[PDB]
Amino acid sequence: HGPAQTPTVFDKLVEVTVVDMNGIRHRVRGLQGQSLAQALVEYGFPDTYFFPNMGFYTQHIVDAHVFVPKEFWGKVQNVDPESDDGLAVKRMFRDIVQDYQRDTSFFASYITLGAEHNGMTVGIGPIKPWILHSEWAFAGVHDSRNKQFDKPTVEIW
Amino acid sequence: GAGAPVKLAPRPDKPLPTWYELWWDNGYYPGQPAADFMFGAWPGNMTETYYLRFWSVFGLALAAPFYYVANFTDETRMPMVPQQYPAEVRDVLVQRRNSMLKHDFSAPDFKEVKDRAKIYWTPMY
Amino acid sequence: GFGGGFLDKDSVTERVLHVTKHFEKIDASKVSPAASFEKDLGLDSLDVVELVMALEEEFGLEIPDAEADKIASVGDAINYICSNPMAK
Amino acid sequence: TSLDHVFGDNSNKLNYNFEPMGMGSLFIRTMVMVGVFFFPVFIMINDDYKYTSFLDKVAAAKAA
Amino acid sequence: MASEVVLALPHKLRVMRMYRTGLKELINWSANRHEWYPRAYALRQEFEDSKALTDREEIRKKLEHGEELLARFRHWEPLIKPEFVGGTAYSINPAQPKLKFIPNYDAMDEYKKGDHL
Amino acid sequence: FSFTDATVENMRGKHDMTSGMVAGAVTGFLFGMGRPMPQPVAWPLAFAGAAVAAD
Amino acid sequence: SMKTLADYIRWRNKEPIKASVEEWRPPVPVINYDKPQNDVLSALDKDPIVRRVLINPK
Amino acid sequence: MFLLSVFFPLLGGLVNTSPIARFLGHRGSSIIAIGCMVVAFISSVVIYYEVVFMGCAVSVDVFGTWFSVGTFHAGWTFNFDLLTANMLFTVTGVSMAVHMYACDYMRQDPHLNLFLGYLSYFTGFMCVLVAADNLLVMLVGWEGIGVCSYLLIGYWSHRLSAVKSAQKAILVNRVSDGLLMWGVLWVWYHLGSLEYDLLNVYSASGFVGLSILIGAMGKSAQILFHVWLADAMEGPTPVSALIHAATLVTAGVYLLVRLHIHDEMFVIIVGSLTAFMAGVFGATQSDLKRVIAYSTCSQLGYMMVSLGLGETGGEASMGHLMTHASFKAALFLAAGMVISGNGGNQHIARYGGSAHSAMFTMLTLMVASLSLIGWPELSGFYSKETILNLAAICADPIADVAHTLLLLTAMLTSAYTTKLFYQCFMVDFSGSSVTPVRNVLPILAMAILLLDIMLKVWVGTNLLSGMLFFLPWGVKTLPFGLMVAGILTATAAVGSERFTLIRFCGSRWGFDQLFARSPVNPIFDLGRITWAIGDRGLLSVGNLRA
Amino acid sequence: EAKQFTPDGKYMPGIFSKAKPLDRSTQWVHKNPYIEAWYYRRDHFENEFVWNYRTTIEALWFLGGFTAAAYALSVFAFRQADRRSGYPKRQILGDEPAMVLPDERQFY
Ligand SMILES: CCCCCCCCCCCCCCCCCCCC(=O)O[C@H](COC(=O)CCCCCCCCCCCCCC)COP(=O)(O)OCCN
Ligand SMILES: CCCCCCCCCCCC(=O)SCCNC(=O)CCNC(=O)[C@H](O)C(C)(C)COP(=O)(O)O
């Protein structure tokens, strides 16, 4: 231990360029170890962009459909397609995305921001109408100014 | 002389074998197998085939004389009869299957006493 | 006594010089510390094997074989023995 | 490593693959072990057989 | 035949290890040291009769035969000095390593010394 | 299953659980043929177990 | 072909995969000449070298 | 005086292992141990004179009933009769000298009072074993000496080979303990009681004598059970002297002499094979303590054959036990003094001369060695010649082969014991450490056992000494010639060129190596099967993924 | 060189103190990664079961073999006990109607 640098937030900052569904580019800052869906929520994106992670014991996690370029395909975390997490991802692809799926389609909670994501450009993918319960649904149209960040709780019930 | 130097055994720094609990590592060098001679070189570089081959002759070399005397020699080889007793003393002494008085070939009930000294294992009902 | 389990340099030197002189071909006046076994003294490999076995006998040691291969001079033997805690 | 020049080093490794015994060797040695350590069972089974064959002889020669 | 360690040695050190192990095995098979001295002299004279050889095939044949002999005559009860590995006095009463002490552990954070649930 | 059951029934001369077990083994081996190998044993066991539970 | 329950059962017929990574081995002392002896009778017992250096010296 | 022979060594062990010993230290604990053995020996001397000579047995109800469920009734009761008095005199007299020796031999050990307390516990459980009147208090003594043998063999616990020797002794004896327990079940079921005086058997069901014989073969270290005895040399020298003289190995022979319910064919064959095997084993060893260990195994074979011969043979068996303990303990103590005089070396190729030992150590080794080889009109001469002459007139044809095996064994014993003396003192010096021990306590410890050797000649063990079994001069004086043949051969120091026989015998017939894979590795592999293939495999029920 | 007690008792936590306090986790072991991996693998060894040749053969001859040996020994002991007690043949599970449960009012 010596005269080495004091830790700053700028050492742990990750910048991601996000293109929303209107084509507008956005600058999104996050921290290392934070997932991508959390940084998207804290940036101030509307609540129609997000949906529950459809696994058991993880519906309190919000998730988004993102398009990831081929260079950053290998930095998405690995999911066993035979495990229960794999069936959760399969349920999300079956029910939420459907025929908006591309070869670049991932889910934003499965991306953990590190230094390798610095400068990565992603885009928000479209989703189909869905319902979890009466207090959390999506009718299909992204016409709402309510941010996801302003919701005090994520309710599974 | 307590406090003599002794070399320490290193910790594992590679992936372990599946059945690693056949080595006894007590902390000092050297460790040992869980049972000695289960693996590793035997003393004198002998093998199991060596001992089994020498024993396949040596075992019959030791079992040969007992068989010969138990099947080809009997009580009459002795130059004298066993120790003589009065009837009231003898009659309880030869009740033991263990007794050496059943080898009295001059007794009037020699055969019957020998027929009563047959070892049984399961008690009948 | 003296030393943290190790014998002193001078007595080890004296004992090694005593052991080294037990050859017919050896001139005694050439036996000194830091003298080579082959080049300076004129002993072959078998003579060196016998000398290291005699030093094992002298200091009560079981010298490991890789260490006995490295000993090639009087000073090497003295430096090895002075690094033994078990040397008596 | 401060005693490796006194008692030997860690360079020579143990030659053993930690693998199970062969199937036939295990079967044969287990059968020998069963025969040696469970010999009262075989003794009593032989007693039952020798007893029932005598009653067979009695029942055969008795009813004739 | 030699072990995988001895087979990796240079030729000079290979012959030296063979002579050294022969002398030690002659110690192990003898009744006393005074029995051992003329056997040591005879073993030395045996090695001196192959010193002036040059043909590497004859050298290899003699070396391999002697290593087979040393594998045959390995004593089942070798003589080891007691305070070394395989001796009878190795690893008896070593000095304890430094072990750490915690004073008054029961008195630190009383009423909360169980397991959580 | 029904033919193997009644055949073993008439062959053994009595009604018991053996005919159902044999018919189950035959039917399950018919189902399990051509499959990798836990299955040519596992399916006779399942059909015989169904017969045993039925009895 | 035909879809059955056998497609949905995780059968235990897959061999576990091993790796080529070198496993740990404990150190052991050196045995200089360790050829395993299986012969009760050997010509090496009556070798002339053995007779010259063990039996014959006075 | 009667309860003082049993309680009071246990009291000495309790004192020296408890936190009372924190206030005494090494110096005070040595005093406590020696005094607590002197009192017990005095009590045993009084018991011996009352019961053996004046014939008055004493029965003591000590602590009431132990447990009593149904007709299975075990009581805390002792009975002091002829065999019990013989054993108590022998055990306490040997253990007193071993304590006096150990207070000086283990002086430089860091935990000396713990060692002394373990020795006292071992002695006390042996006294409980021989003083019991029923089978269950005997089993208390049996397992107590087993546990204390484990604690004392693996005393130097930082050495792995000592720990494995102690574990091996436990496991080998556990097999025979299981068979002995099943035999106790047979005895109680078919006689109705557990007390010795109500166990009079004329004709029982075969499993009784066989299973009790197997249980005795474990403790007395007979054939296929001797493997633990040689490895028990990892413990210190007082442990070996007390194991091989008075405790542990004499317990199975005592049990068979007490019960007398054996079948003689098994007993004679096992004993004679053991005697010949241990005779050839000890002839080819170079470790000084291992030769004496194998001579112990050989003499236990002699006693086994004798108790096979009959009731007179049982008395001769007890007599040889009693005389064997004294010179065997003396041999081990003298060997310990020779080892300490030579810097801890145990190889007999590195001895020689008369500088590394006291005059009394050499005299002790000489006199105990002469008693062991059956030199005429010493202690072992009477008992060993009695067993040999009783085996020469038995009417069982099996005893014909046994007598020949015993005579060959006698020649082998006089060979290797003379070799032990010859290598130690007569040859030129070939060690390098001369630190002879001349302390008062070990010398007095040796002198006491030599006094007991003289006492056995002057006062016999039983009435058999002086009785003449009528044999020709050729049959009678042949063991003397066999002793002389062993002495002449060993002093000539001759050897044979049949090296494969030499390495087959010197490696002790490969029993340990064959046992390393005939039961042991299969037990490990069957455990692998029952865990991996059964618990994790065939019986395992998995999860339903959804 | 921490001070976790006042001179009159009174344990102090030392939350903001520089010196490292001795506590419950002071003697926790430093984990060797390979030992942790081997114990994890042995903890989940049911994932390594496979119906190969050796597994099937050893599960037949040892597990089923010794289970059948123990069933045969149990039936042998039951029948021998009933014969040595004066009973007739008795009805075990699947053995046709016969005698079960001897009467105490009867002499056998
Ligand atoms: C971790 C293992 C440690 C092992 C420890 C050593 C091995 C022990 C093995 C055996 C243990 C047995 C202990 C039993 C304790 C007492 C049981 C009896 C209870 C009781 O009330 O009985 C009365 C108590 O008497 C008495 O107790 C006698 C009265 C007091 C006079 C003697 C005082 C005792 C001195 C002992 C010295 C040290 C000896 C060490 C063992 C005797 O009368 P009862 O009702 O049974 O009537 C029948 C005869 N009257
Ligand atoms: C129990 C008894 C077992 C018997 C043990 C085996 C006894 C057989 C001995 C006979 C076999 C041989 O000579 S093995 C053959 C040995 N001969 C050679 O290698 C040729 C010489 N070459 C050289 O390089 C050196 O002189 C060299 C001598 C190597 C080193 O000595 P230096 O560096 O000074 O020069």
Helix axes H251-259, H82-105, angle to 10 degrees: 170
Which stretch of DSSP H or E encloses residue I99?
none
Query: Regarding beta strands A13-19 and A121-124, do their DSSP bridges make them parallel or antiparallel, or are they unpaired?
Result: parallel
How many Cα atoms sit within 13 Å of H526 on the Cβ side?
21
Closest CB to B14 among I34, I83, I86: I34
| Residue D6 touches chain G, beta carbons under 8 Å | no
Q: Judge if the beta carbon of residue E9 lies within 6 A of ligand 2.
A: no
Can you name the residues that pair with H333 across neighbouring β-strands? none
Query: Regarding beta strands A121-124 and A130-133, do their DSSP bridges make them parallel or antiparallel, or are they unpaired?
Result: unpaired
How many Cα atoms sit within 13 Å of I76 on the Cβ side?
14
Yes or no: say if H306 and H314 are a contact pair by the CB < 8 Å rule: yes
Q: Which ligand places an atom closest to the C-alpha of E71? A: 2
Contact list in D for residue C67 (CB cut-off 8 A) is 5
Question: In whole angstroms, how large is the CA radius of gyration of chain E?
Answer: 27
Q: Judge if the beta carbon of residue E36 lies within 6 A of ligand 2.
A: no
Contact H522 D21 (CB under 8 A): yes
Q: Residues lining ligand 1, CB < 6 A? A: H 7, 10-11, 61, 63-64
Give H529's contacts (C-beta < 8 A, 6+ positions apart): I58, I59, I62, I63
Q: Please report, in angstroms and rounded to a whole number, the separation of the first and last CA atoms in chain A.
A: 50
Contact G36 B45 (CB under 8 A): yes
Q: H helices of chain B, where? A: 48-72, 87-93, 110-116
Yes or no: say if H2 and H60 are a contact pair by the CB < 8 Å rule: yes
Can you name the residues that pair with A106 across neighbouring β-strands? A66
Q: Return the residue of I nearest to E110 by Cα.
A: I11
Chains that touch B (3 or more CB pairs under 8 A): C, D, E, G, H, I
Give F43's contacts (C-beta < 8 A, 6+ positions apart): F28, F29, F31, F32, F35
Yes or no: say if H328 and H303 are a contact pair by the CB < 8 Å rule: no
Interface of G with C in 9-38 (CB under 8 A): 30, 32
The dihedral over CA atoms of H274, H277, H282, H286, expressed in degrees to the nearest 10, equals: -130
Which stretch of DSSP H or E encloses residue H35?
helix H21-48
Residue for token pair 């810097």: H343
CA atoms of C59 and C52, how far apart (whole Å): 11
Question: Measured between alpha carbons, how far is residue B8 from residues D9, F13, H297, I28 in Å?
Answer: 11, 77, 37, 21
CA atoms of B62 and H401, how far apart (whole Å): 10
DSSP state of B8: B
Counted across chains G and H, CB pairs separated by less than 8 A come out at 9
> What sign results for the dihedral spanned by CA atoms H530, H533, H534, H540?
positive
Q: Which of H119, H47, H56, H133 is nearest to H90 (CA)?
A: H47
Q: What DSSP letter does each residue of C17-86 carry, written as one string? A: HHHHT--SS--GGG--TT-BIIIII---HHHHHHHHHHHHHHHT----HHHHHH--BHHHHHHHHTT-TT
Contact H526 D29 (CB under 8 A): no
Both tokens assigned to B63: 């079992």
> Which residue type is seen at H357?
S
CA atoms of F1 and F49, how far apart (whole Å): 13
| Residue G17 touches chain H, beta carbons under 8 Å | no
Is residue I20 exposed (0-12), middle (13-18) or buried (19+ Cβ within 10 Å)? exposed
Ligand 1 probe mutation, H8, H63, H78, most atoms within 8 A of CB: H63
Q: What DSSP letter does each residue of A76-107 carry, written as one string? A: SPP--TTSHHHHHHHHHIIIIIGGG--TTEEE
Yes or no: say if I87 and I102 are a contact pair by the CB < 8 Å rule: yes
The length of chain F is 55
Of C8, C27, C44, C69, catalytic: C44
Cα E10 to middle of ligand 2, angstroms: 13
Closest CB to I34 among B15, B18, B125: B15
Q: Which of H337, H358, H365 is nearest to H453 (CA)?
A: H365
Q: Which ligand places an atom closest to the C-alpha of H8? A: 1
F47 φ/ψ sector (left φ>0, alpha ψ -120 to 50, else beta): alpha
Can you name the residues that pair with A46 across neighbouring β-strands? A147
A23 φ/ψ sector (left φ>0, alpha ψ -120 to 50, else beta): left
Both tokens assigned to A98: 């459907």
Yes or no: say if H229 and H221 are a contact pair by the CB < 8 Å rule: yes
Which stretch of DSSP H or E encloses residue A19?
strand A13-19
Mutate to test the interface with E, among G33, G45, G49 (most CBs of E within 10 A): G33
Identify how the structure was determined: cryo-EM
Both tokens assigned to H471: 């044999």
Contact H160 E91 (CB under 8 A): yes
Q: Which atom in ligand 1 lies closest to the alpha carbon of residue H61? A: 49
Yes or no: say if H112 and H26 are a contact pair by the CB < 8 Å rule: yes
Question: Measured between alpha carbons, how far is residue A97 from residues A86, A102, A144, I66 in Å?
Answer: 16, 10, 20, 57
| Residue I11 touches chain E, beta carbons under 8 Å | yes
DSSP state of G35: P
Question: Measured between alpha carbons, how far is residue H83 from residues H2, H118, H258 in Å?
Answer: 15, 26, 8
Minimal C-alpha gap between B104 and chain H (Å): 8
Yes or no: say if C34 and C73 are a contact pair by the CB < 8 Å rule: yes
CA atoms of A78 and A88, how far apart (whole Å): 13
CA atoms of H529 and H118, how far apart (whole Å): 40
- Documented resolution in Å: 2.8
Pick the residue whose CA is nearest to atom 28 on ligand 2.
E51
Both tokens assigned to H168: 């091996």
Both tokens assigned to H115: 């060692």
| Residue H349 touches chain I, beta carbons under 8 Å | no
Both tokens assigned to B73: 């020699």
Minimal C-alpha gap between H521 and chain D (Å): 8
> Which residue type is seen at I20?
K
Both tokens assigned to C25: 């071909």
Yes or no: say if G10 and H542 are a contact pair by the CB < 8 Å rule: yes
Cα G28 to middle of ligand 2, angstroms: 28
> What sign results for the dihedral spanned by CA atoms H191, H194, H200, H205?
positive
Q: Which ligand places an atom closest to the C-alpha of H65? A: 1
CA atoms of F38 and B48, how far apart (whole Å): 39
Active site residue C44: yes
Question: Measured between alpha carbons, how far is residue H197 from residues E9, H134, H184, H482 in Å?
Answer: 73, 9, 15, 42
Yes or no: say if F44 and F23 are a contact pair by the CB < 8 Å rule: no
What is the SS3 assignment for H105? helix
Other C-beta atoms lying within 10 Å of the C-beta of residue H259: 19
CA atoms of H323 and H455, how far apart (whole Å): 10
